Amino acid sequence: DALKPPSMYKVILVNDDYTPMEFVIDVLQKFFSYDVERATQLMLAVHYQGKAICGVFTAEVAETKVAMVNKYARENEHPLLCTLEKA
Amino acid sequence: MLNQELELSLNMAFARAREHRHEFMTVEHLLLALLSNPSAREALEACSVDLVALRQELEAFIEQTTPVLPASEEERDTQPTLSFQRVLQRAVFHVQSSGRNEVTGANVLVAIFSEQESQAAYLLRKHEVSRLDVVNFISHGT
Ligand SMILES: [Zn+2]
């Protein structure tokens, strides 16, 4: 037999044409604890690269952060999409 | 109904997590708390698990991987992970699906095995405990 630890996951913010830059920064500060400056740099990366990694967490934590972000986007009526993928 | 000892375990796990300012109460906090829940503890001893080593592996993983809320942030507090919620719901489901109602720490332990990407399930299998090991113990004793 062979057994490995579950893997770590990248949590990603995807770009869209409707979500205001201000909300993206809000999400980065509120859910990932970035200061305004780093938050702003990540927001631009999402804008130019089309996506950006907000953090790397265990599978369990990553899944929860993703659901929290998507619920907050939904409540504020923005199609901001948060996703995860194996680190 | 979650029995009294299980409920004591859950509320203290949650209080401990809040005191450490953790953003999340995880399935690992849950397993760590079950180490001293009579029902789950008995099952684990019956599987010859080194509870000292498991406790340590759980505590290390928890403090190293659980984000801490900023001393600043007082508008949001400790939340259970989705995985944690599924485990409690699965434990209730397993018990009800057998026609019973009392949920013990051992039923919660059984449900942890279904969170395959959890560190908790990993650690349990690392200590050679299978879901069926716990179910046999619950059904047939040592
Ligand atoms: Zn802690």
Swiss-Prot record, chain A:
One GO MF term attached to the UniProt entry: protein-folding chaperone binding
Coiled coil residues, start to end: none
An annotated GO BP: protein catabolic process
Role of this protein: Involved in the modulation of the specificity of the ClpAP-mediated ATP-dependent protein degradation.
Similarity comment: Belongs to the ClpS family.
Subunit structure: Binds to the N-terminal domain of the chaperone ClpA.
Name the record gives this protein: ATP-dependent Clp protease adapter protein ClpS
Annotated organism of origin: Escherichia coli (strain K12)
From Swiss-Prot, chain B:
Repeat 1: region residues: 2-65
Lineage: superkingdom: Bacteria
Ranges where the record places region Repeat 2: 80-142
Domain Clp R: from-to ranges: 1-142
Signal peptide from the UniProt entry: none
Biological role: ATP-dependent specificity component of the ClpAP protease. It directs the protease to specific substrates. It has unfoldase activity. The primary function of the ClpA-ClpP complex appears to be the degradation of unfolded or abnormal proteins.
The family this protein is said to belong to: Belongs to the ClpA/ClpB family.
Quaternary context: Component of the ClpAP complex composed of six ClpA subunits assembled into a hexameric ring in the presence of ATP, and fourteen ClpP subunits arranged in two heptameric rings. Binds to ClpS.
Protein name: ATP-dependent Clp protease ATP-binding subunit ClpA
Provenance organism: Escherichia coli (strain K12)
Taxonomic classification: Bacteria, Pseudomonadati, Pseudomonadota, Gammaproteobacteria, Enterobacterales
Gene that this sequence comes from: clpA
